[PDB]
Amino acid sequence: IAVGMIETKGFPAVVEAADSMVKAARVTLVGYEKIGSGRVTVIVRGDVSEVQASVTAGIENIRRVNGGEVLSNHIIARPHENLEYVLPIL
Amino acid sequence: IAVGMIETKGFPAVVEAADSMVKAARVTLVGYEKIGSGRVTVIVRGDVSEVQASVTAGIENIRRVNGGEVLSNHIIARPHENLEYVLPILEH
Amino acid sequence: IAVGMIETKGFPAVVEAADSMVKAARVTLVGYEKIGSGRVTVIVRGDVSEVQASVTAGIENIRRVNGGEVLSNHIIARPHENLEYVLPIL
Amino acid sequence: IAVGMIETKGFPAVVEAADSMVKAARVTLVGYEKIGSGRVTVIVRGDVSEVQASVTAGIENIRRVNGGEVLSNHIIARPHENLEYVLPILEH
Amino acid sequence: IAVGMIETKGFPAVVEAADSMVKAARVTLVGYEKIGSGRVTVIVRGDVSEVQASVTAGIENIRRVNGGEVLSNHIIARPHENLEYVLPIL
Amino acid sequence: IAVGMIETKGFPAVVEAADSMVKAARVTLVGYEKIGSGRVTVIVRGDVSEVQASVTAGIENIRRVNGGEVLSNHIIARPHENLEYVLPILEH
């Protein structure tokens, strides 16, 4: 039920973030959010330990990306149920 | 009928803001608004006291966020009814 | 029939602009316009003297906003009827 | 069949532009176009002489606008028909 | 079957680009693409020699535009058929 | 099942990228993605060898483009299935 997010400047980087994330750990990819300014976020759910593993992987592997830039990242272990239908984290 | 808002630059931050807000106090998260340029606002309604507690929590918990940035925040204790049907400050 | 507009960088500020506007004077709020770049405008109609009162209030009260920034503001006392259905001022 | 355009950075300015244009001369306001980055263009059609009078008025009246800024302006006296169905320069 | 494109910062300039393009040569205007950041592209098709003529005209005439700014331009003489329905070049 | 992407600042560049990619090798152009700020990505799928040949060609041919700029590029040889239904990397 944890949520993990990686926000990049650039689309290719966000794809590699996503790929690496789902490969590293037992997490599933649920979201891809654009907010303009080149800022795109990919979002996964899973056990916190796994989501935690997945996010670490994504951040590491983005430096493999020519032009890759990570803007922010975050994990929430136990997100409130109210978030599930306001925010595209589902 | 109070309204609280936190505007961040970055999406993960806005999610923490939201999570923190609804956890800290008895308030309902009613929305999330993009206006471009990375700027996204998370919005809650509740008793002023609870909204004030939600906003304070969200602001202080965003500093935990790697790459998190808070651009603005605001509370209106008693917003005018006119605002509800022009501005996205009732449930989306 | 006057039109008053306040444009801010930031959404919360635009809400406070709106709130203050409708509270100060006999004006009604009709519009909220986004043009990107963080630029959002709120728009009211009413008697010029009131719209005038309302805009003054909104500009004053935005400094109460943590992160508040006013970009522009304007009043038109007697807007042409052609504007009403091209521009979201209605 | 002339076309006149004024592009501003800021929405209130574009409204003044439009107001000024249709007041100064015998022209019709046919649209308003956003392309991002605050950039919004107001567009009119009319006789070249009237369009030229509209645009001049709009530009000079925007300096009245607090925070107003004009980014570009242009007139085409006799625009090619091809433009009408690719570019938003007939009534929106 | 050639494709010619002119990208400006600003809308009025893109209109003058378009106008000049279709006037200079035997080319037809097919596209107007926005990608944000003020960046708008107009797109024509025609014989390469004509498209070539049309693009030269558009670039020259944009300096007539108060506030005119050309960001990029390009011609492809013989674009792959796969481009026609992925990209708004048709 | 490899994926190749080229992200440009500017639309004409992205068209050259695409043209170059599908011409250089046996790959299919599956999309074009805007994320704002001028940033547009062109995306192909194919055998890794062909995708690698497509991307190299596109990058080197964009330097021909007047005003062309490449912001990022990337290839994933064996992308995870999960990506296909969250990210726009199957045909648009």
C41 interfacial to chain D (CB closer than 8 Å): yes
Residue D59, Ramachandran bin (φ over 0: left; ψ between -120 and 50: alpha; else beta)? alpha
CB A10 within 8 A of CB A69: yes
Select from F56, F52, F39 the least CA-distant residue to F3: F52
CB F28 within 8 A of CB F46: yes
| C62 to chain B, closest Cα gap in Å | 10
F33 interfacial to chain A (CB closer than 8 Å): yes
E3 interfacial to chain F (CB closer than 8 Å): yes
Select from E55, E43, E57, E47 the least CA-distant residue to E26: E47
Which chains are adjacent to chain A, needing at least 3 Cβ pairs under 8 Å?
B, F
CB B81 within 8 A of CB C19: no
Instruction: Please state, in angstroms and rounded to a whole number, the distance separating the CA atoms of residues F54 and F25.
Output: 6
How many residues would you count in chain A?
A: 90
* Other Cβ atoms within 10 Å of E12 Cβ, number: 27
Please give the class, per CATH, of domain F1-92. Answer: alpha beta
Instruction: Please state, in angstroms and rounded to a whole number, the distance separating the CA atoms of residues F24 and F50.
Output: 8
DSSP F5-56: EEEEESHHHHHHHHHHHHHHSSEEEEEEEE-STTEEEEEEEE-HHHHHHHHH
CB C1 within 8 A of CB C42: no
Tokens of B42: 């998370």
Instruction: Please state, in angstroms and rounded to a whole number, the distance separating the CA atoms of residues C51 and C22.
Output: 9
Q: Resolution to 1 decimal, in Å?
A: 1.6
CATH of A1-90, one of 3.90.15.10, 3.30.565.10, 3.40.1260.10, 3.30.70.1710: 3.30.70.1710
Alpha-carbon distance values, F29 to A15, B48, F59, F76 (Å):
17, 54, 15, 15
Phi, psi of B22 (to 5 degrees): -80, -15
CB F58 within 8 A of CB F82: no
* Other Cβ atoms within 10 Å of A11 Cβ, number: 27
Q: Which of A33, A59, A86 to mutate to test the interface with B (most CBs of B within 10 A)?
A: A86
End-to-end Cα spacing for chain F: 16
> Interior CA angle at E85 toward F43 and F59, to 5°?
35
Instruction: Please state, in angstroms and rounded to a whole number, the distance separating the CA atoms of residues F31 and B15.
Output: 29
Phi, psi of D51 (to 5 degrees): -70, -40
Which residues of chain D lie closer than 8 angstroms to E29, CB-CB? 82-83, 86-87
CB A18 within 8 A of CB A78: no
CB B73 within 8 A of CB B14: no
Locus of tokens 């006037």: E23
DSSP C49-68: HHHHHHHHHHHHHGGGSBT-
Instruction: Please state, in angstroms and rounded to a whole number, the distance separating the CA atoms of residues F25 and C87.
Output: 49
Sheet with strand F27-34: strands edge to edge = F27-34, F39-46, F2-9, F70-76
Select from E65, E67, E71 the least CA-distant residue to E7: E71
Indicate the domain borders of chain C. 1-90
CB E68 within 8 A of CB E8: yes
Locus of tokens 């929590």: B57
- Does the distance separating the beta carbons of A86 and B68 come in below 8 Å? no
SS (H, E, C) chain E: CEEEEEEEECHHHHHHHHHHHHHHCCEEEEEEEECCCCEEEEEEEECHHHHHHHHHHHHHHHHHCECCCEEEEEEECCCCCCHHHCCCCC
Phi, psi of C7 (to 5 degrees): -110, 125
Tokens of B22: 């609804």
CB A53 within 8 A of CB A44: no
Residue ranges of alpha helices (H) inside chain D are 11-24, 48-62
* Distant-in-sequence, close-in-space partners of E12: CB < 8 Å, separation ≥ 6: D5, D7, D41, D72, D73, D74, E65, E67, E68
| A74 to chain B, closest Cα gap in Å | 6
What number of C-beta contacts closer than 8 Å exist between B and C? Answer: 83
